[PDB]
Amino acid sequence: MDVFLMIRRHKTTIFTDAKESSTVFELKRIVEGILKRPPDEQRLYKDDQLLDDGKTLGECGFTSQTARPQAPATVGLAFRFEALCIEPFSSPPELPDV
Amino acid sequence: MYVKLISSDGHEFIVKREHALTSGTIKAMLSGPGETNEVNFREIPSHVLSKVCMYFTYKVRYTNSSTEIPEFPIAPEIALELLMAANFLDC
Amino acid sequence: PVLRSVNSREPSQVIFCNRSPRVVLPVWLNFDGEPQPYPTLPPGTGRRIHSYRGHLWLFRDAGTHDGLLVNQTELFVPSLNVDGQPIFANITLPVYTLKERCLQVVRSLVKPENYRRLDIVRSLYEDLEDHPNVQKDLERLTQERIAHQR
Amino acid sequence: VSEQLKCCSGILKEMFAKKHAAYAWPFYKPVDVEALGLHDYCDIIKHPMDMSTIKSKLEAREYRDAQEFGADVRLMFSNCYKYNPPDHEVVAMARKLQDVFEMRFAKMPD
Ligand SMILES: Cc1ncsc1-c1ccc(CNC(=O)[C@@H]2C[C@@H](O)CN2C(=O)[C@@H](NC(=O)C2(F)CC2)C(C)(C)SCCCCCCNC(=O)C[C@@H]2N=C(c3ccc(Cl)cc3)c3c(sc(C)c3C)-n3c(C)nnc32)cc1
């Protein structure tokens, strides 16, 4: 079963999919392939919660229902280690009258 | 393999090339007349472009389906800005 | 009188299956090509249907008249039940373009007389007022079959 | 009685014949109330009947004489006449099929 993730750090955001049976380490291998940073130099969080490299994405709580294409699940990313800092997206304006 | 979409307010969105080509505008911007990896949008903010990238993954994922697809959700708040973006991007 | 049901009296046992989150309004094209509304199917529900060979069907959102797919096409025409086996008609959402999907949400929130009071380009006004329509789509499908047969 | 029930099978066999299919087809299988979108058939018609059900009772030897078999064939037609107004196409079909049955059933050995 496929899980659709949104890997985030500062003002960067990576849209990628992964198997539920896939491990947290295999996700660091994808981040490396994109942002050119060995896996030992990165950490992955789920709402201020460190993820072990041995654990699978399913065991971390990312499931088909949680991490969907139209509504992907957020994964925190940090380099070096720096404090986890995800800049929030801009605010939508007030619902226009009508 | 991947492409970078940049919003009006800095935010960078790394997205699979095959996903981003869902947009006629993006397809035209980083193809050739007769090629680039980055595309900057001066007038599309984070909260919109993030939703557009979600649409790309949704569109690529469920065009291949044949049994049942889910609704693509749009919060009333984003509806107006996302329309104008969808018009500009031709998707 | 090009897209119409043939008046065969050859029965066809069908199953309509609503696998959309919308309330579905089935539309039978009668023998003159005029569209007839049938009772609506709630979401996730299915039911047995008595129809006939060469009868044209077409499915819509009961509320908004947004087009829906049936076995990944716009039109459903029953075959003859081989060994009395039912013909399945699986009704689903299409993968709407982000544009057509946004129009739906803006239409569902704004009253038609207030479309003009939205701060958007004149080309998005004319796209909002151009409601999904059965008569509109039938014209398209008629010309698609002309080029397909030629 | 054995020879009369052999006739009945022969009558029913002919009612299923392709030459009569043009007007016999509505009465082949039991009335599917969901498929026909009817919300009242079960209130009005207490004892449903059809040629398929009759064929089973014939092979299962549930008809003691030919007069028990005829009663069920007439019930089938009665149900159709009772439920539908006379102008409905199905009534015209029921009559054309009863014309066939009554003709053959009237030449029953005794
Ligand atoms: C509830 C619902 N929710 C979503 S869709 C739906 C739904 C509701 C009703 C139906 C009923 N089916 C139709 O309306 C079909 C669908 C479409 O293919 C068009 N259609 C027709 O029935 C068309 N008629 C024909 O093609 C023919 F008549 C030329 C052969 C219509 C729309 C032009 S006429 C059908 C509307 C009139 C309904 C009469 C209501 N009465 C009955 O159903 C009584 C029933 N009639 C019939 C009957 C009706 C017509 C014919 Cl010449 C012969 C028998 C009947 C049987 S048994 C059996 C297998 C049938 C078909 N029957 C018996 C015996 N006694 N009564 C009956 C289907 C779906």
Numbering used by the authors:
A (entry chain A): 1 to 80, 85 to 102
B (entry chain B): 17 to 50, 56 to 112
C (entry chain C): 61 to 210
D (entry chain H): 350 to 459
Paste lines from the article:
Targeted protein degradation is a novel pharmacology established by drugs that recruit target proteins to E3 ubiquitin ligases. Many of the E3 ligases that are currently amenable to TPD are members of the large family of cullin RING E3 ubiquitin ligases (CRL). The specificity of substrate recognition among CRLs is conveyed by more than 250 different substrate receptors (SR), such as the cereblon (CRBN) and von Hippel-Lindau disease tumor suppressor (VHL). Successfully designed degraders induce a tripartite binding between SR, degrader, and POI, which is correctly positioned and sufficiently stable to ensure effective poly-ubiquitination and degradation of the POI.
To sample greater diversity of PROTAC exit vectors and linkers, we additionally designed AT7 (1) as an analogue of the previously disclosed AT110. While AT7, similar to AT1, branches out of the VHL ligand tert-butyl group via a thioether linker, it bears a fluoro-cyclopropyl capping group instead of the methyl group of AT1. This capping group is known to enhance the binding affinity to VHL as well as aid new PPIs within PROTAC ternary complexes. In cellular assays, AT7 exhibited potent cytotoxicity and BRD4 degradation. In an effort to understand these nuanced functional effects, we solved the cocrystal structure of the ternary complex between BRD4BD2: AT7:VCB to a resolution of 3.0 Å. Remarkably, despite the unique linker geometry and increased lipophilicity, the ternary structure of AT7 proved largely conserved in relation to the cocrystal ternary structures of both MZ110 and macroPROTAC-134. While there are no discernable changes in key PPIs, the entire bromodomain shifts laterally (r.m.s.d. of 2.1 Å) to accommodate the new PROTAC molecular architecture. As in the structure of MZ1 and macroPROTAC-1, VHLH110 sits underneath the bromodomain in a hydrophobic patch formed by BRD4W374, BRD4L385 and the di-methyl thiophene of the JQ1 warhead. It is therefore structurally plausible that a mutation of VHLH110 to a hydrophobic residue such as leucine at this position could have a beneficial impact on ternary binding affinity by enhancing favorable hydrophobic interactions. ARV-771, MZ1 and the macrocyclic BET degrader macroPROTAC-134 showed higher levels of augmentation, while sensitization for AT7 appeared attenuated.
